[PDB]
Amino acid sequence: ESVKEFLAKAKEEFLKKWESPSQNTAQLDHFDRIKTLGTGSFGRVMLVKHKETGNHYAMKILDKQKVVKLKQIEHTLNEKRILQAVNFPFLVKLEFSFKDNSNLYMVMEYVPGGEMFSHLRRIGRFSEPHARFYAAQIVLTFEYLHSLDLIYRDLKPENLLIDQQGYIQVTDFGFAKRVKGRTWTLCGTPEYLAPEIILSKGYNKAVDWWALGVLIYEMAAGYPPFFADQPIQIYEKIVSGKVRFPSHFSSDLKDLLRNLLQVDLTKRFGNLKNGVNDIKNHKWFATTDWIAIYQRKVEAPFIPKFKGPGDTSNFDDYEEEEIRVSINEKCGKEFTEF
């Protein structure tokens, strides 16, 4: 009943913000630009400093014209509407949002420890206890999101930041969506796509549990289970129903992964009658104190090395390009609700 009442309150609080989203809560000239932290085809993420408070933030900047051209309008509206409404210990906090003539802006807490991806590639692989510590946080986060009728749809190491206590903060809600029943959009990252996405079916939250299987495999092996030079070759492996495990994997890990990487979505852990509890009760998680993880009372496997809230050492170097704001408004109608 404790979990039921917790999730009922979580949904109440989410829905109140979902139905009345915050808008226009800062402006660009409130911030100093520090450094580009990452870039993509329609936006980038900047380290910024608020000029009055001195606080650092990560500012995601999306070019409205590129969002339209790459048919991401609904997805960008989803991202901001969801982020302003959620609240969970392992989700990055949205602090401000606004738009101008050219761009959309989402100003988030800055997590200086960097992406899990960097740390995984620097160490090679994580031990099972280390992978399990991160996996448990994802399990609880998906329990939260799915109870709100949200599907995340972009689980991968680059989207999981490591905070000052060594815990995960999920970022990048660009593909997240509120879904009752099924949804159909082809999106995600190739190595992490469930078979039913590849096959163009109407799919549900089971795709997030598939992606968790991919993530756990990648954390414990150092590489994902389905890999190839062309996406089509990756997709053939994904749909095949075959996966090979390194000999160092424990039997418990292999068993859990066979049930998450289950090609038949109707048989996949997380999508059965017992829902998330088939995962939480699996022997691979026998040592996990779920409440202690939620309360952040477990000592983390490692703390990222960084000098302070403005340190960018754990992020990499990108060409520093202008953030231009047109003298004329672009795509006003398309982004009215932002």
Side-chain angles (χ1 to χ4, degrees), residues 18 20-51 53-65 67-68 72-91 94-108 110-120 122 124-163 165-226 228-229:
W18 179 251
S20 300
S22 58
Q23 286 179 98
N24 191 44
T25 55
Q27 68 199 35
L28 185 61
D29 69 21
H30 291 173
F31 303 90
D32 284 323
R33 176 190 172 143
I34 309 303
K35 197 171 195 298
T36 297
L37 302 171
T39 63
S41 52
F42 55 98
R44 62 202 131 161
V45 178
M46 309 297 302
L47 179 63
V48 300
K49 186 172 167 179
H50 194 282
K51 291 154 66 176
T53 63
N55 286 327
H56 288 90
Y57 297 101
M59 176 184 282
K60 182 170 182 168
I61 306 173
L62 304 183
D63 182 315
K64 283 187 278 169
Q65 292 183 128
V67 166
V68 175
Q72 297 299 308
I73 298 168
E74 190 184 341
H75 286 169
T76 71
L77 298 175
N78 288 338
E79 177 168 22
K80 178 256 175 172
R81 194 176 174 188
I82 296 165
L83 278 175
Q84 65 85 41
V86 294
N87 164 223
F88 199 66
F90 316 120
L91 296 178
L94 181 71
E95 305 273 21
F96 312 97
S97 70
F98 56 94
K99 61 202 180 191
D100 63 22
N101 282 347
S102 292
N103 305 312
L104 311 174
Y105 303 83
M106 287 172 281
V107 182
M108 286 163 284
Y110 176 52
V111 184
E115 295 171 9
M116 178 193 293
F117 184 69
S118 299
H119 297 290
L120 177 60
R122 186 183 281 105
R125 65 200 185 201
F126 299 152
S127 71
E128 295 191 26
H130 188 168
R132 171 160 48 242
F133 173 80
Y134 295 151
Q137 296 170 60
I138 302 302
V139 170
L140 291 172
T141 298
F142 284 174
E143 179 171 25
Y144 171 82
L145 291 175
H146 295 171
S147 80
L148 302 181
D149 310 296
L150 297 170
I151 311 178
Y152 176 62
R153 301 199 295 190
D154 206 17
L155 189 69
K156 58 184 179 178
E158 301 97 308
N159 285 346
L160 305 177
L161 306 175
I162 308 303
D163 73 18
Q165 298 181 344
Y167 282 74
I168 287 179
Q169 294 193 28
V170 181
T171 193
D172 197 343
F173 272 59
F175 298 144
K177 184 180 182 185
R178 194 152 191 247
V179 173
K180 292 181 179 183
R182 302 162 288 175
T183 200
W184 282 263
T185 307
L186 174 59
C187 63
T189 301
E191 286 82 358
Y192 276 76
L193 296 184
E196 59 268 31
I197 303 178
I198 290 160
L199 300 167
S200 300
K201 295 178 176 177
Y203 61 85
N204 80 336
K205 66 179 176 164
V207 306
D208 280 340
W209 296 120
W210 172 281
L212 176 64
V214 180
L215 182 76
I216 294 173
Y217 185 116
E218 180 166 16
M219 289 189 294
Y223 50 89
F226 314 109
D229 259 72

Side-chain angles (χ1 to χ4, degrees), residues 29 55 103 207 241 251 262 275 283-284 329:
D29 69 21
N55 286 327
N103 305 312
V207 306
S251 297
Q262 168 56 253
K283 191 171 176 305
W284 193 70
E329 186 188 43

Side-chain angles (χ1 to χ4, degrees), residues 206-226 228-229 231 233-235 237-241 243 245-258:
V207 306
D208 280 340
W209 296 120
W210 172 281
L212 176 64
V214 180
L215 182 76
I216 294 173
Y217 185 116
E218 180 166 16
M219 289 189 294
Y223 50 89
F226 314 109
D229 259 72
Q233 295 168 318
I234 301 171
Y235 301 154
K237 296 180 172 201
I238 287 161
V239 303
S240 77
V243 54
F245 299 113
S247 60
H248 64 81
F249 278 20
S250 70
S251 297
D252 290 337
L253 178 54
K254 293 184 282 191
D255 187 81
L256 174 62
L257 293 175
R258 291 185 197 278

